Each structure stands twice: as structure tokens, then as C-alpha cells.
Amino acid sequence: QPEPDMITIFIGTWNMGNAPPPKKITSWFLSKGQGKTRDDSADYIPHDIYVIGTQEDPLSEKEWLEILKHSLQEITSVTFKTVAIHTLWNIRIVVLAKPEHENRISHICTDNVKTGIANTLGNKGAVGVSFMFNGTSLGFVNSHLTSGSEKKLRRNQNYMNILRFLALGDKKLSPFNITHRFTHLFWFGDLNYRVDLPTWEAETIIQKIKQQQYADLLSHDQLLTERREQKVFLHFEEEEITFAPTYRFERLTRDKYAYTKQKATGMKYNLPSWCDRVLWKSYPLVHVVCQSYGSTSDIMTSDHSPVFATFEAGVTSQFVSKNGPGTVDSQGQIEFLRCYATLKTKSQTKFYLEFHSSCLESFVKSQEGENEEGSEGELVVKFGETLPKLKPIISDPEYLLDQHILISIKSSDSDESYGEGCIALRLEATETQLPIYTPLTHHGELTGHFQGEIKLQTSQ
Numbered sequence: 001q002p003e004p005d006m007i008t009i010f011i012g013t014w015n016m017g018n019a020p021p022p023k024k025i026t027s028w029f030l031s032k033g034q035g036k037t038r039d040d041s042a043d044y045i046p047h048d049i050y051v052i053g054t055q056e057d058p059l060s061e062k063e064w065l066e067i068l069k070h071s072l073q074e075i076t077s078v079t080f081k082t083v084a085i086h087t088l089w090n091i092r093i094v095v096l097a098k099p100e101h102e103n104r105i106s107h108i109c110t111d112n113v114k115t116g117i118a119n120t121l122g123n124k125g126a127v128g129v130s131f132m133f134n135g136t137s138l139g140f141v142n143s144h145l146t147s148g149s150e151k152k153l154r155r156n157q158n159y160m161n162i163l164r165f166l167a168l169g170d171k172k173l174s175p176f177n178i179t180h181r182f183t184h185l186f187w188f189g190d191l192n193y194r195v196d197l198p199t200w201e202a203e204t205i206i207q208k209i210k211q212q213q214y215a216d217l218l219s220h221d222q223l224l225t226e227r228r229e230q231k232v233f234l235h236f237e238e239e240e241i242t243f244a245p246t247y248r249f250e251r252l253t254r255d256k257y258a259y260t261k262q263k264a265t266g267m268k269y270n271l272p273s274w275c276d277r278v279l280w281k282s283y284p285l286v287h288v289v290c291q292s293y294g295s296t297s298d299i300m301t302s303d304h305s306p307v308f309a310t311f312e313a314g315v316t317s318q319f320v321s322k323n324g325p326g327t328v329d330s331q332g333q334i335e336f337l338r339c340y341a342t343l344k345t346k347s348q349t350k351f352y353l354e355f356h357s358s359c360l361e362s363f364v365k366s367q368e369g370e371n372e373e374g375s376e377g378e379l380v381v382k383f384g385e386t387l388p389k390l391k392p393i394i395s396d397p398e399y400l401l402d403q404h405i406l407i408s409i410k411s412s413d414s415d416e417s418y419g420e421g422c423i424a425l426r427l428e429a430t431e432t433q434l435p436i437y438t439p440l441t442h443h444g445e446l447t448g449h450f451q452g453e454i455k456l457q458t459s460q
């Protein structure tokens, strides 16, 4: 049985509105309804992994697991294994996988983050799951962010608290948050960003939706606009939205948007919005292709419609040579030339680099770089030719070219990371000086850049 080099992953997000689901929810798992939908010819083909995020979920874990497993059995005739389930209040994540993957999956982690302080702590936040699939790390975040059209800044704060404090993936990657820990990171949920148009335009917006004319509405979508201004979800991708707003519907139909202010809404308008979203971030030059992104039309127990997204995701095998794991392979090396970091920091301290990768027996600390002033005020940290030679555990190019090097730039004075980034070893050539580049972030905010040249030696 050959190990896969691709899997397909189903991501679902549904705010259930504290109501039980209807008897049939198979359209969700089949990616049928509005938007970018799955071909009918694929209906019996199981995805490898199903990741289900709910919000306002009134069910016990047992009740929901029984509905999900029975649903997938009806669609695929496969009895899925439970990889993980984690619930914070009414926010839940379930990961299900095909039985053949049971032994390919390891290092399962779960965590949650509660957002807000006093007033604002009690029902919003995130749950997450990570695991290894053979040689590939996968992270999944289901978040329910602050509601309300006039709280986009709060949502962006909730996002930064979640990506700082959610403890998933390899703890040895201590300088790195979840936005660097995984080959593929999927972040979904009721993110609660709204279409930011005047209240008086409610009926105009509904008109536009009925005509399937989403362009003038998406130009005011707060997640698209906040992302464009680098206020949230920096370096994440989202597929084009081609489905109607998934909030706020009258229950038991999809023919009516319930937008008017009510005591029950805190006298807030809920203009039709794309509250329910799926985003991802994969390491550079890994295969990831969105194959569906849409909403169901036939599940109407909630004031939200379920959203689905599916992905092809590249995966690698658990590589064993005669040498590594358990030693280095002297036929392999990674060299760095003409390297410098450019930092936005106003501080003057010395910096060094840390290199972290599962291709190394452990992380590597560089010597201190030499600080200079950039021509436009920047701090430039010059490493020149001074960075160490990295010694990978396996020199075989079929392994090494699929690997990545995480970089942290740290203060000598405090050992705190000022910036994190990632370099792919999927090079155009080996034994050849080639340009490398990564933006650097800290707490998911841009803090600088790292650039230079790499020289990769493999056994070929």
C-alpha cells in the first residue's frame, strides 16, 4: 500500500443558532448548494479528513458525533474514526478520518482560547486541533469572534489573542505561534465580519443578493477590507466568495433575511453578511488547492447557513534512511550567503537567528549579526556569510527538497523573538546560489523581512 502524496480535506463551519440540526445534513459534507460546489461525480468519494467547526452548538459531543458519523456513513459507506473532539462552551471542533489513516495520524493536540476580559469573557473564543499526517503537520482552528457590525477592531484583537495563545503543534517550536507551526493551517468559524453599508441600504443589499450580484457587497466586507489593510489574517488565503451571505436568515426558510433591530439583537441591525468563513495558510511551495467553497441551501434550523470548503493538500511520507533519523547524513548541507534581516523595531540591541526544522536533529543558533541603519530609517541586521552550515538528518533530495526552515530573529539581551518566517527548500537547483526571502512577523503582525541566498547540497 503506497503512502499518499495528496489528501483531500473537508472544512465545515456552522453556527447552529442553539437549535438541533434537521434530520438530513448530507448536502454540507457533499459541498452542494451555492458558491463553488463539488461535482456530482465525486459524491461517493470520501474525503481523507473531515474537520467540523460549530458555534452556538446545543448538542452534547456524543449527540453530534452520532449525527456526523451516521451522515458520512450514509454518503460514503465508510465508518470514520474520531481523531479529536474539543468543545469550549458552545464552540466545537470534530476531526474525523478514514480508517486507513489511523496509523498515519499521530501527535494529536487540542486547545482552546477564551477571548475578552470580564464583560467580554464568557462565550467567544476558539478551539483547535493539530496532528501529524505522516511527515506533514496539520492545524485546524474554529473561532467564534465578537459579533456586531461596529466591532471589527474587537474581532481583530480576538484573532491576535487566539494566534498568540492557542497551544497546538510542536512545543519545541518555542519562538513560533500557530501561523508558523504547520505545513497547512486552516482557520474557519463564525468570524462575524459584516458588510459595512448604511442600515438604510438593507433592502438594496437584499435586492443585490437576489440578483446574485455580490461584487458591490464584497467590496464592503470587513474581513476582505481589514485583510487588504493588513489588520488581520496576514499571509492567509481565502477562495473567492460566490455564494450569498450566510447570515442572518429567518429560520425554517432561506427566502428571508432577518436584518431589523430587535430587543433580542440588543437593538442592532444584522445586515446580510458573510459571517462564516474558511481561510488557510500553508508553507511556501506546498500543494494546496481549494476545490469547493460555498454554503448549503437546504439546512434551515439556524439563522446561519452552513459553509463548506474542500482542499487538495500535499503530504509527505515518514522518511527513513540508513543514516537519519538518529544521526546526520554528511552528504547534505544548507548554506546561507549575503543574508540580512530588515526590522521595523525602533530598539537598538544585538540580534541572532534561530533555525528550526524537522530536517535538523535540533534547532541552531547563529552568531550575532551586525546592525546598520537602512537608507529610510530601518534597522538592517547583516549576517553576510556568517550564518552556520545546517546539517540535515537525511540528504536524499526526495526528502530534503520537501522541507522548510523556520527562522526567528531574537534579541541577545532578552532572547525574545522580534520576527518569525519560513523558507522552502523546494529550490530550482541544488549546489547553486539562489535568492531566498520571507516576511517576518511577531504575534502575526509584520515586523520585518529576511533575505539572502541559499546553497543546498543533496545526495544527488
Ligand SMILES: CN[C@@H](C)c1sc(C)nc1C
Binding pocket: 227, 228, 235, 236, 237
Ligand atoms: C499576495 N497575497 C495575495 C493573494 C493577497 S492576500 C490579501 C489579503 N490580499 C492579496 C492580494
